[PDB]
Amino acid sequence: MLIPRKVKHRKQHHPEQRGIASGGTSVSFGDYGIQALEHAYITNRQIESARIAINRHIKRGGKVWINIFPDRPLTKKPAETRMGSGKGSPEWWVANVKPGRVLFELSYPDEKTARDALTRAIHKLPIKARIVTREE
Amino acid sequence: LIKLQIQAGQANPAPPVGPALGQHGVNIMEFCKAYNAATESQRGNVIPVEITVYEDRSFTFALKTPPAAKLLLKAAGVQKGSGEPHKTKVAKVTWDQVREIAETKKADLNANDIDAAAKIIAGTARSMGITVE
Amino acid sequence: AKRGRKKRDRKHSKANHGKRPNA
Amino acid sequence: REGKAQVSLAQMEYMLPRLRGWGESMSRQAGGRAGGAGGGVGTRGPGETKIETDRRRIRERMAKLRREIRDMKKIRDTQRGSRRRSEIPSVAIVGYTNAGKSSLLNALTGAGVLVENALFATLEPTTRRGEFEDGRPFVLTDTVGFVRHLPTQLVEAFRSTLEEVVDADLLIHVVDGSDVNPLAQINAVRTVINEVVAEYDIAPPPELLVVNKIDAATGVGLAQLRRALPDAVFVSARTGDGLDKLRSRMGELVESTDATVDVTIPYDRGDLVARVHTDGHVDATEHTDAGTRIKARVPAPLAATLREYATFA
Amino acid sequence: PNKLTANVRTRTGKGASRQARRDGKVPAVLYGHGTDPQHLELNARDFAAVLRSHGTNAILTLDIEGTEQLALTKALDVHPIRRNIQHADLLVVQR
Amino acid sequence: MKVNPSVKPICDKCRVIRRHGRVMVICSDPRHKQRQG
Amino acid sequence: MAKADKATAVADIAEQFKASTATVVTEYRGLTVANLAELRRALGDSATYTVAKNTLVKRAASEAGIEGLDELFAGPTAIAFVKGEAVDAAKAIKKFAKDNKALVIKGGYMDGKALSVADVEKIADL
RNA sequence: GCCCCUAAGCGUGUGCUAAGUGGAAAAGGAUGUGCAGUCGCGAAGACAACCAGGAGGUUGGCUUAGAAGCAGCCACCCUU
Ligand SMILES: Nc1nc2c(ncn2[C@@H]2O[C@H](COP(=O)(O)OP(=O)(O)CP(=O)(O)O)[C@@H](O)[C@H]2O)c(=O)[nH]1
């Protein structure tokens, strides 16, 4: 499942949520795509889930792209512990997704089935997202 | 109006002939008896009989040439039809004999128009899978 | 949880102008 | 969910007797990114954290899991209604492991079940309807892998399989032609049906034998195991082959409850014989004429419906 | 069809652009071979209308306040959430 | 009557309707009939 | 309705009536395909017995040049374009009033003109 | 803040709401309702319904005794 090979610093602050996306805000690989509309931390798990959803929906066709890689690590203190004595170990790899960013992109000869698979992916994702298209 | 397609042979076979004649009306035998009596001379050709029934009963002795697809089969040179028409064609049946034999059968079915008959027979050949030239 | 929800939502009034002490 | 719960319970209960020592040793450095033993799902995903970390949490979760399996037993027996309500013969593919059970199922039924290279590939017993030589829309189910010295710490997983084998009639015993002691393989895997019947005693079901991997197996075995050895039939290859008499002897050894007493079907309605033709097979359709006379088998209700009309030939 | 009116910008800046975009007048800047930048405004409705059919590249007859002038669409700064053009950059053409 | 926050026509014959301020799906097949509730 | 059909609707009657010295119009309803063909195709030797839209052909009639029979199109119409021969055509149209009785001649265009209540029978009673 | 409790508007003009929404809440579901756009059709007759046909080839070919259009699979044309 998606994961960085290595990261320079293992314990980083949480990725910021403020502001809109000034980059990655257009379909530039495939024909359709999922444009988010709400700040969130999309995680390796959700990305894998949506990818499997789209691939299972489209039968051995089309090409899929992911314009976001989970690289920011989020820690977690071990259970049943007081507050203090250092940050927790890395727990979840998250990609800071911002309003307007295109998360998934698809290119499939058909139209209805591409739309349907994209809807599947959106449902699997946490955030509110719409289906944008290369046309405009 | 019940049509049974059959040749001039045979006599009361249930799986192909268990019709309303045996269900309700005259005995089962008389139907085929009176049907084959006036058309024994068929020799394998299919001569379907279309019987009518009135408020109580009214036998009718009616006939017709074999199906269009079956005539195509007879002339083509095969006994079994192809289950994959336009995927594996068997024979390229020509049009001269088709015309000479359909110049009256289609005049009875719909009309004697040679072009219309040609288009209909082309459709039937396409259906069977043994198309024409 | 009802008491907390209510005390917090009390901040959305025309008189507090949106902020309440100890929200 | 069934697997992710029952395997989780088995793991918790295996920890139970050794919650002290090595479990703490594992948790000490934790997985360290990823450990050599995951959790409820093992292959990443859920179960990423650990198995046993606190005795309280472990006990709590074993309780919850036991309740969950209580729920799943009801769900499973509800699902398994139609077959028991219909009295439809069922057969079970009983193989030790990697004996190509799923592949054999794909064969003979056109099924498309997964067939992966591993000693434990098929997770839950899956089944499909099949046809015998003449009909009998019977049922065929696989079994989950059984390895020597069946770990009793993991029975909740094989409990469903055990039920599905004890609620069946004819058993077909698949072996794998890899090891040198297939006799040991078969005896070992058969040691389990003994306790299966001990618990859920109904009867010793009729038995049949088969061994997959024919193409690659017996490379130096020759047909000794095919002639001298007792009951066994095998043509499947390590990828798939043709099936010749596995589907004939399977029908001849399955329950023959279907009565074969001759019945007389008259003409009567326009297609009254259609009922018998579609129900009870049409074996020996000695069609004659008019009120066609024939000889075919029929089930209990059709036999009782035609009783009065059963005039001797 | 390709004839789009225009109106020079009375003011310019954050407030002027915001007010214009609220009233539905996409701002634009016209410059190029003539080498004399002009800040103007167009009706976003007709601008998008012509853009739908003629595509991003197109030779637009910009009817300026006082005369006409040919132009070419160079840039379209568009908001990614609200799919609406925020600013247009037109390249004059000398023919 | 499946009470579910998510009601969608399961089959081509299923028709949605608003009744007593409460969305309900009704079909010729009784099994598909459901309500939002 | 359809634009192409409308466009052809001129020629759909123009040459037909230009050639046919006579044509019939009547409220047709009931005769199956077989009954209709019994005279349309089964007896096709000197007249094309067809039908056409009675609402779209009202303008097409004016276009073709006929104007006497325009108020009689308000309802089903069964046209019979003959190439002139009337002694057999009148008999053909009068034959159906024994077996079906569902086929009368409400009117039509005789010799580029209209007709009366008795002309329907007097076209050719010989 | 201005119906009475309670000092002061049951204020005036446009609209909106049927939910007591106002007078708590998410993913998601949704033939509720106002408005601004678009694409088909339609006064040469459409959208609903009503009167007749909806045919011949032909039980179209594979399958099946069977499959006539209706378990299922290929073709899926024309005569008027
Ligand atoms: N012996 C045999 N092996 C096969 C056959 N078809 C595929 N295989 C190979 O065997 C491997 C294991 O699959 P399989 O033996 O079917 O699994 P199984 O024995 O049915 C169930 P489990 O693996 O849990 O014991 C697969 O990787 C496949 O490539 C076959 O017909 N016979």
XYZ file of N, CA and C and ligand atoms in Angstrom, chain D residues 95-104 114-123 143-146 175-177 211-214 236-241, ligand 1:
143
model
N -9.769 -31.645 1.193
C -8.363 -31.808 0.869
C -7.495 -31.283 1.991
N -6.296 -31.852 2.095
C -5.396 -31.498 3.184
C -5.023 -30.024 3.070
N -4.261 -29.666 2.039
C -3.995 -28.278 1.677
C -3.312 -28.282 0.322
N -3.471 -27.191 -0.421
C -2.827 -27.030 -1.719
C -3.136 -28.187 -2.657
N -4.161 -28.973 -2.345
C -4.552 -30.103 -3.169
C -5.430 -29.692 -4.322
N -5.413 -28.415 -4.684
C -6.197 -27.964 -5.811
C -7.684 -28.105 -5.610
N -8.175 -27.915 -4.386
C -9.611 -28.015 -4.160
C -10.359 -26.930 -4.924
N -9.933 -25.679 -4.766
C -10.606 -24.584 -5.453
C -10.504 -24.745 -6.965
N -9.354 -25.206 -7.456
C -9.206 -25.413 -8.891
C -10.123 -26.520 -9.383
N -10.205 -27.621 -8.641
C -11.121 -28.679 -9.034
C -12.548 -28.163 -9.058
N -11.218 -18.374 -6.603
C -9.798 -18.061 -6.601
C -8.984 -19.319 -6.342
N -7.874 -19.453 -7.065
C -6.962 -20.575 -6.885
C -5.543 -20.040 -6.811
N -5.073 -19.770 -5.601
C -3.787 -19.129 -5.381
C -2.800 -20.147 -4.835
N -1.519 -19.930 -5.121
C -0.473 -20.801 -4.606
C -0.237 -20.521 -3.131
N -0.816 -21.344 -2.263
C -0.637 -21.203 -0.825
C -1.313 -22.380 -0.141
N -0.835 -22.695 1.060
C -1.415 -23.793 1.816
C -2.771 -23.440 2.410
N -3.120 -22.143 2.480
C -4.421 -21.680 2.960
C -4.887 -20.552 2.037
N -5.595 -20.920 0.973
C -6.013 -19.956 -0.036
C -7.498 -19.634 0.069
N -8.354 -20.649 0.025
C -9.781 -20.422 0.178
C -10.109 -20.208 1.649
N -10.748 -19.077 1.947
C -10.986 -18.673 3.327
C -12.234 -19.328 3.903
N -13.749 -27.223 0.926
C -13.386 -27.160 2.332
C -12.142 -26.300 2.496
N -11.945 -25.809 3.713
C -10.784 -24.994 4.035
C -9.622 -25.909 4.401
N -8.408 -25.385 4.266
C -7.232 -26.224 4.402
C -7.137 -26.856 5.780
N -6.713 -28.119 5.805
C -6.467 -28.863 7.034
C -5.013 -29.308 7.035
N -6.223 -35.015 -2.561
C -4.867 -35.005 -2.032
C -3.987 -34.217 -2.994
N -2.788 -33.876 -2.530
C -1.800 -33.164 -3.330
C -0.616 -34.078 -3.610
N -0.289 -34.252 -4.890
C 0.800 -35.126 -5.283
C 2.159 -34.456 -5.242
N -6.766 -37.202 -6.240
C -5.493 -36.539 -5.971
C -5.149 -35.662 -7.169
N -4.997 -34.362 -6.934
C -4.719 -33.413 -8.004
C -3.236 -33.454 -8.365
N -2.795 -32.476 -9.158
C -1.388 -32.330 -9.525
C -0.900 -33.476 -10.409
N -1.798 -34.094 -11.178
C -1.411 -35.294 -11.915
C -0.263 -35.002 -12.868
N -6.609 -33.755 -13.101
C -6.814 -32.315 -12.974
C -5.612 -31.467 -13.365
N -4.393 -32.004 -13.346
C -3.185 -31.231 -13.616
C -2.963 -30.204 -12.515
N -1.804 -29.545 -12.512
C -1.560 -28.453 -11.578
C -2.152 -27.137 -12.062
N -2.807 -27.134 -13.205
C -3.506 -25.961 -13.715
C -4.941 -26.266 -14.109
N -5.245 -27.518 -14.431
C -6.555 -27.891 -14.919
C -6.458 -28.910 -16.033
N -7.430 -29.816 -16.100
C -7.466 -30.860 -17.113
C -8.916 -31.210 -17.404
N -3.042 -29.921 -8.044
C -3.607 -28.916 -8.733
N -3.105 -27.671 -8.572
C -3.651 -26.639 -9.237
C -4.780 -26.881 -10.134
N -5.117 -25.693 -10.663
C -4.274 -24.769 -10.148
N -3.404 -25.343 -9.301
C -2.343 -24.643 -8.565
O -2.374 -24.979 -7.183
C -2.121 -23.803 -6.417
C -2.920 -23.835 -5.124
O -4.315 -23.709 -5.388
P -5.286 -24.863 -4.836
O -4.414 -26.064 -4.596
O -6.495 -24.948 -5.732
O -5.764 -24.348 -3.392
P -6.699 -25.328 -2.536
O -5.990 -26.589 -2.250
O -7.983 -25.644 -3.424
C -7.264 -24.536 -1.017
P -5.840 -24.268 0.056
O -4.777 -23.614 -0.725
O -6.286 -23.316 1.267
O -5.301 -25.660 0.648
C -2.487 -22.616 -7.287
O -1.460 -21.630 -7.269
C -2.627 -23.164 -8.682
O -1.685 -22.568 -9.572
C -5.269 -28.268 -10.248
O -6.227 -28.560 -10.992
N -4.645 -29.204 -9.532
